[PDB]
């Protein structure tokens, strides 16, 4: 696209500069450009891609929730008719969010996932696929909500099967995958008991493997375990 004339290494350099300047839309465009060069991504590069789009979609999700809440309060009894503006603007934001999710899912499909052979890359990409279908599910209403949910579930499940066979229980990618899949169960799939069971089992198996870790790896794993504990404290 518009990044077609820039060197891959320059795109990566600029992505890091954009991160430092908190220019996440720029960061995402640079990383998209790097992906479209056709070479596989390193661990560092995968994390840049993820950070960039997470921040972009994060802003859109937060706006959407504000506007959806205003829209819902307009559709109470006793509320004054104010015209189509709230719905129109919520739809605009919603459309832009769906466009970002579609862009990420397109990159994963062309051709990050099919080229990803090592467990660390394949699980990372399949987790991302789950996450961006989950974001689409948060705003879906019509007759595709069920198919979107099933696409999220299927991506997460495949990632879980690989992570269980190929990674230690303390691996941060495995832990983050399990955390997000539990959020899927709780908030999207209406399965709070499944969410709780997964979070507990994940926490306990990591706890029993901590003894194998260096001081630095210990810190990385226990950070994510703390997020599992926070959810469990809220859910139970």
């Amino acid at each position: 696209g518009a990044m077609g004339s820039m060197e891959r290494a320059s795109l990566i350099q600029k992505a890091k500069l954009a991160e430092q300047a908190e220019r996440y839309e720029d960061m995402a465009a640079f990383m998209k450009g790097a992906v479209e060069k056709g070479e596989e991504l390193s661990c560092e590069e995968r994390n840049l891609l993820s950070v960039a789009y997470k921040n972009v979609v994060g802003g859109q999700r937060a706006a959407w929730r504000v506007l959806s809440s205003i829209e819902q309060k307009s559709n109470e009894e006793g509320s004054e008719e104010k015209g189509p503006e709230v719905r129109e603007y919520r739809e605009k934001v919603e459309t832009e969010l769906q466009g970002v999710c579609d862009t990420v899912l397109g990159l994963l499909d062309s051709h990050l996932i099919k080229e990803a052979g090592d467990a660390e890359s394949r699980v990372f990409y399949l987790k991302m696929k789950g996450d961006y279908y989950r974001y689409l599910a948060e705003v879906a209403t019509g007759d595709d909500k069920k198919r979107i949910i099933d696409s999220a579930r299927s991506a997460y499940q495949e990632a879980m099967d690989i992570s269980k066979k190929e990674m230690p229980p303390t691996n941060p990618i495995r832990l983050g995958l399990a955390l997000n899949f539990s959020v899927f169960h709780y908030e999207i799939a209406n399965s709070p008991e499944e969410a709780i069971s997964l979070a507990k089992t994940t926490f306990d198996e990591a706890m029993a493997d901590l003894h194998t870790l260096s001081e630095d790896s210990y810190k990385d794993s226990t950070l994510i375990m703390q997020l599992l504990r926070d959810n469990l404290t809220l859910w139970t």
Binding site: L179, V183, Y186, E187, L227, D230, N231, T233, L234, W235
Partner: peptide, 7 residues
């Protein structure tokens, strides 16, 4: 306090 995903 709300549900959190990985950060």
């Amino acid at each position: 306090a709300r549900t959190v995903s990985v950060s």
